[PDB]
UniProtKB/Swiss-Prot annotation, chain A:
Subunit structure: Binds to host ACE2. RBD also interacts with the N-linked glycan on 'Asn-90' of ACE2. Cleavage of S generates a polybasic C-terminal sequence on S1 that binds to host Neuropilin-1 (NRP1) and Neuropilin-2 (NRP2) receptors. Interacts with host integrin alpha-5/beta-1 (ITGA5:ITGB1) and with ACE2 in complex with integrin alpha-5/beta-1 (ITGA5:ITGB1). May interact via cytoplasmic c-terminus with M protein. May interact (via N-terminus) with host bilirubin and biliverdin, thereby preventing antibody binding to the SARS-CoV-2 spike NTD via an allosteric mechanism.
Part of the intact protein present: 398 to 446 of 1273
Effect of mutating residue 20 to T: In strain: Gamma/P.1
Function recorded in the entry: Attaches the virion to the cell membrane by interacting with host receptor, initiating the infection. The major receptor is host ACE2. When S2/S2' has been cleaved, binding to the receptor triggers direct fusion at the cell membrane. When S2/S2' has not been cleaved, binding to the receptor results in internalization of the virus by endocytosis using host TFRC and GRM2 and leading to fusion of the virion membrane with the host endosomal membrane. Alternatively, may use NRP1/NRP2 and integrin as entry receptors.
Region feature (Integrin-binding motif): 6-8
Outcome following mutation: residue 20 to N: In strain: Beta/B.1.351, Omicron/BA.1, Omicron/BA.2, Omicron/BA.2.12.1, Omicron/BA.2.75, Omicron/BA.4, Omicron/BA.5, Omicron/BQ.1.1, Omicron/XBB.1.5, Omicron/EG.5.1; May enhance affinity to human ACE2 receptor
Protein name according to UniProt: Spike protein S1
Gene behind the chain: S
Record annotation: effect of changing residue 48 to P: In strain: Omicron/XBB.1.5, Omicron/EG.5.1
Length: 49, 49
């Protein structure tokens, strides 16, 4: 599952979490058997303005 | 007390069921003893625990 988020609210990509993103965009199940990996993507996903 | 042999079992059963019901008033370490309220104030990562 590949998407871009922000450090604030990034903690919601964990099982059973709430918030605008976790509730309306991507919701992980409570019984999750897997892991989430994140890395700084300033060079590719950040553009001026 | 002449009928104490039937009274002790009747009293023990009434008290045992009364205590069994009363255990719902016990906290066991939770923020509140009432299940309907616990879910409302607790987000799933803490509500499930």
């Amino acid at each position: 599952d590949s998407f871009v988020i922000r450090g604030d609210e990034v903690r919601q990509i964990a099982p059973g979490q709430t918030g605008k993103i976790a509730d309306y965009n991507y919701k992980l199940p409570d019984d999750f058997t897997g892991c989430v990996i994140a890395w700084n993507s300033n060079n590719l996903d950040s553009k001026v303005g | 007390s002449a009928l104490g042999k039937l009274q002790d079992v009747v009293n023990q059963n009434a008290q045992a069921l009364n205590t069994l019901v009363k255990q719902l008033s016990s906290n066991f370490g939770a923020i509140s003893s009432v299940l309907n309220d616990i879910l409302s104030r607790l987000d799933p990562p803490e509500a499930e625990v």
